[PDB]
Design a protein around this ligand. Structure first.
Ligand SMILES: Nc1ncnc2c1ncn2[C@@H]1O[C@H](COP(=O)(O)OP(=O)(O)O)[C@@H](O)[C@H]1O
Ligand SMILES: Nc1ncnc2c1ncn2[C@@H]1O[C@H](COP(=O)(O)OP(=O)(O)O)[C@@H](O)[C@H]1O
Ligand SMILES: Nc1ncnc2c1ncn2[C@@H]1O[C@H](COP(=O)(O)OP(=O)(O)O)[C@@H](O)[C@H]1O
Ligand SMILES: Nc1ncnc2c1ncn2[C@@H]1O[C@H](COP(=O)(O)OP(=O)(O)O)[C@@H](O)[C@H]1O
Ligand SMILES: [Mg+2]
Ligand SMILES: [Mg+2]
Ligand SMILES: [Mg+2]
Ligand SMILES: [Mg+2]
Lengths: 349, 349, 349, 349
């Protein structure tokens, strides 16, 4: 019958997802072992299901494992250490996280003849290179989910022609602004889109033609592998150990707490690292502009709009504005820029 | 219906209880039979009713059984065994001990329809295991008490909506410090509560969130069964047979008498075990901190205040200081820490 | 700095309010759907922002809607019907009217030390009766405004210890005139306050003691539900169908245009009901006197000051003068006496 | 929207600023620590905000420092240096002075997308040498300032293409007299402008052409570093200590009062130093005669008008008349000479 549409993302930083109903979810890309949560059930009332995703996922052979995942995994000390998430696209780390949002974004009691289009993405250099790696993994995806503490299952199995493949940052401007920026696009310019990811920051440019339609440039656009917010967590982790002078290491949760604040609490004291947070944010923003103008000669003057996105783009927008003032603006949903771009351009099918 | 409130404990070493009117009692959990106290009545003034609990207990079948209980039963040689006491919460021991502090704290001049909200406790790990059995027992409760040598009686029966079930150490720092630690809790810290009881040792933490609300962590919190003051009494008892050099052994009253002082008067002279009293209390304090850090990795750095509870921590506070100095501290009522925590957090109804 | 204060009124005739800084807004309680405005921007300049509030309301769930509200909704023939708008205080329609006046009373660029202490109200009998639903909704409230044609947003979200309720016109004479009427209040004299609104009408009196301090009379003050200005609009509608005799009915605008004028411009002609206008005005105010003396037996003889308020009280001054001439008077702002009464007696906080 | 005009001066003696609407401020260039002003409110009225500048300053990373600046800081004994204040134009001291300058000139009720164009001042040699140091720091500026005891904050931010830079002595004769002295200037003369600043004195001349337009001479004009009012405070410093015959040093406050009165009240006595104070101004009056003719050969006879400026020259006008008696003349506002020129000639945009 008619098939539903759910747009997800495989971001190493945090998983970003939305359905056809615009009901959207967001949670960090961290998994852990699952343990029986009934003692904490009586003390604090579990209201936020996204905060408390204890979950068990069957295979087709009745094998399933307990999992804490996300914020609940970030409270665990032995979770996925988040600096070492598996770069294999077919990892079980990928498997649980992929079924996680699909459990959360399928509403209750849809008809079984109504399937769901899933819309995903890859980093831009890694899209065609790893397309069939994901394509077989999407067809291999055949599970059944069970939520602990909320107790509603989903049957999850899809073949080819139920899936959708467009890169990270591609449909973010190829949809959702492409039918809206027509007042600004005139002829033979370039719109600028930079998705500031956690591991990898993506640089993507669209040339507009004579016919007021976007066309893609691949020599002026690239994936910055190893450039992203992961540099800041790695930098400030040295900054805490250099300021503590003891070898005291923050955990995984204090790491992500640090580069949102710059003021970690530590043993009756706030170890002040706000100055080093200023040091990282100006350094990374300078590094993005330099790699941008590596791809950009005098065609930077051929720009008319520069949009940025990502959670890093939410927190670097002032320093990343300095490519071009009055042209470096921010997109509406910096996290969900891929998500609705996957959604509306997934509505073509 | 202005329903009354009484908060009690089921502590193995002693029973700690308090009413709505903040009238509080404390007495050891030792029972014996009741025998006719008219001879000693003319000798010594039976004045302290808490010291002299000769009590008459009916049942639903009107089977009166007098009992010496508490301090007077401790004076009896044929008392409860009490060092290998059965841990059944539905025991006749616990039927007497729970009904003991009721009539000792049920006040005078109650209305005809007005009931009493009773608040009890469980061990934290066994709160899942033993929730039914106390709920079996409190529903079962239908008796009538009577006080020998003080000439008054109480009716005692309860139903549901009068029962209240929170674990040991749950409301002690949830409430009772609730508006006081609110100025201390700031952002993403844990607070430390350790109950050093007689038989059991509890560890319980609370993550406070961004929103200044405590949330519970079941995996940094456990009941250390087999660790407590019961080890020290059992250690020094064999040490008493050592330093006496004759194989002579104490009784049950001298057992509790010893490790409150350490210098037992035996055969016309003191017997000195003060060195081994310092040894065993430091030995248990070593075992607490290590098993505390069994649940506490570098999250010990995420503490801001540690409190200790139970009767043992009051006399361990110098040796239990070594957890985190000037962050660990002593609660003001080490016995009644659970009781007032049962009181106000039991006053939700 | 310190936390900010806003007093607004949820009155169903016209939404009223005045902030901490004595900026005040007022607009009728009419909402409509919003549609984009660029054409009428070019013809006629939007000089008053309150005149032409096209508004978008954000949420985290991405369920934004455009709205015409107040005067801009009054010109709409597709607006709310307003003759049967439901009194659900937790309704989404009440979210539109309440979030409207928030950013209007918040000046541009307030710091984060400022947090808005809202002071709203209920009807008198509906104060205790309908406390918790609005207590739930103001606890629930989390949005962000967007002004079309003026383009500035306000993140609006309220914690507890930021909300405050009072009954309708409670501090209107407990404060705001209480320093002035100390010349007039002497000893055990009832001062009188009447608020004549659209749906409901409240009459509240305060007994003063021997110590010249006011005290509340719950048996000499009540809510006149079903007696208000809406009955004049319901009468003048039926008088117009008695005068037009076609079956034609005025819209939501021409009905509200009538009871201020009495001479509707219909079919290019002044269909007149000036006699039926005054008769319906002596109908309502006489129906107040019976409800006034329904709460006032012989105790009317002890009065010293009758005050009236409400927008209906502005247009029924001589109609309601016959309660007690040479004593009854008019407050300075008949409409804003609720909001300033919420303001000044809200300045306890 | 429209971009407003605010003209300030970075004078090391006193910061001299004005908005587009001619509301102008003046305060000495001294900062100090900001501490809790509560008690001084009740005794004496905090009316003049120029008199009582208690300032909180947020950063964009929000380090929240607090300062007394200017007149209140002059009364503070622990104030800034001001006799050897650092010449770093990018200092935090210069920022706090500039933030205080912007705060009293940015008006309330300014529309939403309006901004401000700002004009600064530079020494005539240092306008090219020290150009980009200031021109980057003004681009760097994004701070939120809080004025205590007046309850209004200012989030102030500036970017490129809104700041504007003209050196000292430029606009006072290029504008502000261009409508007036154009009747006076005829053919091939030089106009004169001598800004007697605190630290540096400014010599600037304009050649008029045949076509009655000003044009600039770089070798008939220079910046007199080490020549100005600051030599008089240095001279009167040792003039007191030699006349005290004790080494008793005046404070920073009495230093400023000394060259305004010459009769300082000291140890219950007026110490009169009128002898050296007449000599010290004539010492300064001598050192500007010589530097005038150092730039002016027989071209001194090619003059039609000499103006003087600077706050020191107001009490030096008759005493610096010795160069050209009645060929020299006086500007209207010797303090505000640079700022009104920066106001008027800064209205290019
Ligand atoms: N409020 C915030 N403060 C600090 N950092 C943030 C915030 N929100 C998001 N981030 C950063 O942005 C990253 C999220 O990037 P995201 O858009 O999910 O890219 P990806 O698709 O690579 O995961 C996080 O790792 C986090 O460090
Ligand atoms: N003054 C004291 N001296 C020595 N030991 C004490 C003293 N007060 C209490 N204790 C010890 O503390 C124990 C009481 O612990 P308690 O807080 O009642 O825990 P529980 O709830 O497990 O019974 C007793 O068994 C006793 O050994
Ligand atoms: N100038 C006026 N002419 C006629 N009626 C008016 C006028 N001003 C106000 N009103 C009437 O008063 C009502 C406003 O009452 P209001 O004080 O806002 O009470 P509420 O708090 O119940 O909304 C309107 O519905 C309107 O009919
Ligand atoms: N009434 C006065 N009496 C004495 N000196 C004054 C008076 N007014 C201003 N001054 C002197 O003039 C100086 C102000 O110079 P100003 O025009 O602000 O130049 P700058 O731009 O270098 O700060 C002060 O340091 C002060 O010594
Ligand atoms: Mg991404
Ligand atoms: Mg205990
Ligand atoms: Mg009203
Ligand atoms: Mg100057």
């Amino acid at each position: 019958m008619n098939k539903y549409t759910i747009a997800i993302d495989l971001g190493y930083g945090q998983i970003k997802g939305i359905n056809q109903d615009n009901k959207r979810v967001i949670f960090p890309s961290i998994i852990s072992s699952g343990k029986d949560r009934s003692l904490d059930t009586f003390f604090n009332s579990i209201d936020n299901i996204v905060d408390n995703i204890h979950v068990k996922i069957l295979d087709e052979y009745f094998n399933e494992k307990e999992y804490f995942v996300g914020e609940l995994a970030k409270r665990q000390p032995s979770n996925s250490s988040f600096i070492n998430r598996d770069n294999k696209i077919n990892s079980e780390e990928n498997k649980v996280l992929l079924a996680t949002a699909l459990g959360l974004l399928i509403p209750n009691d849809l008809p079984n003849d109504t399937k769901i289009h899933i819309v995903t993405g890859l980093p831009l250099e890694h899209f065609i290179k790893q397309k069939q790696a994901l394509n077989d993994m999407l067809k291999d995806f055949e599970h059944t989910i069970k939520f602990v503490d909320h107790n509603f299952s989903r049957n999850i199995k899809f073949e080819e022609s139920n899936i959708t493949l467009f890169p990270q940052g591609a449909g973010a401007i190829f949809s959702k602004i492409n039918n809206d920026i027509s007042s600004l696009l005139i002829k033979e310019t370039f719109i600028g889109l930079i998705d500031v990811g956690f591991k990898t920051t993506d640089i993507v440019v669209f040339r507009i033609n004579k016919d007021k339609e976007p066309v893609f440039e691949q020599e002026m656009s690239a994936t910055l592998d190893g450039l992203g917010m992961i540099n800041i967590y790695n930098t400030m982790d040295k900054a805490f150990t250099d300021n503590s002078r003891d070898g005291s290491k923050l955990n995984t949760e204090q790491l992500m707490l640090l580069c949102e604040e710059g003021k970690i609490f530590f043993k009756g004291d706030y170890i002040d690292l706000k100055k080093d947070l200023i040091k990282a944010r100006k350094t990374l923003s300078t590094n993005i502009i330099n790699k941008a103008d590596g791809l950009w000669g005098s065609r930077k003057n051929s720009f008319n709009s520069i949009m940025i996105a990502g959670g890093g783009g939410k927190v670097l927008y002032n320093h990343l504005k300095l490519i071009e003032p009055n042209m470096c603006q921010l997109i509406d949903n910096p996290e969900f820029a891929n998500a609705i771009g996957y959604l509306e351009f997934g509505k073509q099918f």
